[PDB]
């Protein structure tokens, strides 16, 4: 007539499958962990959730079966209960009902039913921070190609503005600080043209082609729905 | 020199031989251009939706 | 007779559409937000 | 993963080197220096090295 469970935030071995995900996105220089005290505490929060339990009420078969209904549902809504119990953290969750075996039934199927809430939630919330880092990473590269097309662009200048004072010098073959002349107007000449036939500043640069490699990775990447608890039984809900 | 000096009067744009000032030109274009666009959202969480009593 | 609401600072899944407009002013080398429990504490202000 | 993800990184670099490589064997080349003897193509070593 009064179901009890008695829950613990959750231990590490219960985040294994959570753990290999992450690490793969770690690698992605993607650093993103769900906390387990933190799942645990929105866990309570939901749990807490009036509008949250009568939703979870009005769609359990089970209590249905047994427009008066609003009235009915405020009055079972009155009867779960959460309180606050250190070496360890740890919440006492109950419910009462005229019948032993139905107290515990609605308290195990409102846990269940908030611990997929969270879940979702959970799982959802890693997908979104993949997309924003996805997203970043693409205008970065789009956007720093551009400038090294623009630096580029004043290095052709420049390199122009170099051949003209190495022919003015004398100096044609090889040998100052803003128109190198060193090379000489010989070297300078067949430089001066492999620069202008450049058609992706890809081409001579690891760290942009690099820069495509993870956008790419980012984008091909998954979370696939894991499943854990967030939170662990000291007392699963109890037989009254 | 003296070619060195002819070619720097024949500077029309300072960018032209900068790159900063080149990329700050396409940033200043960016921001301009970017806009924010109305989003909604709500400030808040429910833990209770307004009742009926 | 009476009716209620229990309202609490909201929560990141909600903020998403936020956090697309943000990355990037960010890329823009703007970095700007809206802390969500700013935003409660305004509403509660308004309100 | 860390691995396979640097060993990829360097194939990159190794092809981007590549590039650069290229385009300095045709410098070397139109300016003389076959022998033994640059900020963005060295020749120093040179069209035959």
Same mark, same amino acid.
């Given at each position: ?10 231990? $590490? ?36 959730? #009036? ?5 979870? /009420? ?20 009155e009867?779960?209960?959460? #309180?606050?119990?250190? /070496? ?9 009902? $005229? ?11 409102y846990?269940d039913?908030i ?12 997908? %979104? ?22 630096? /580029? ?13 190495? %022919?003015a ?15 000489g107007?010989d ?26 490699? /993870? ?10 729905? #894991? ?9 699963? $809900?109890?037989? $009254?």
């Amino acid at each position: 007539w009064t179901s009890a469970a008695v829950v613990t935030p959750p231990e $590490p071995v219960q985040w294994q499958e959570l753990e290999k995900t992450f690490t793969k996105l770690r690698v992605l220089d993607l650093d993103i962990k769900i906390d387990r005290t933190e799942a645990f505490n929105l866990f309570i929060k939901k749990f807490q959730s #009036v509008s949250l339990l009568e939703e979870y /009420l009005r769609s359990s078969p089970y209590v249905m079966d047994q427009l008066d209904l609003h009235r009915a549902i405020v009055a079972l809504s009155e009867k779960m209960k959460a #309180v606050d119990d250190s /070496l360890y953290t740890s919440w006492t969750l109950s419910f009462t009902a $005229p019948t032993s075996e139905e107290a515990q039934t609605v308290l195990s199927g409102y846990i269940d039913y908030i611990s997929a809430l969270v879940v979702k939630e959970s799982i959802e919330n890693v997908r %979104n921070k993949l997309e924003i880092k996805t997203q970043f990473e693409k205008e970065k590269l789009a956007q720093d190609r551009i400038k090294m097309k623009n630096q /580029l662009d004043a290095n052709i200048q420049r390199l122009n503005y170099s051949l003209d004072i190495a %022919n003015a010098a004398g100096i044609k073959k090889p040998v100052d600080p803003d128109f190198s002349i060193s090379l000489g107007a010989d070297g300078i000449e067949r430089k001066l043209e492999i620069e202008k036939a450049v058609t992706d500043v890809a081409e001579l640069n690891g760290e942009l082609r690099n820069r495509q490699y /993870l956008v790419e990775q980012l984008t091909k990447a998954n979370i696939n729905d #894991v499943n854990f608890t967030p939170f662990k039984y000291q007392l699963s $809900p109890s037989l $009254p």
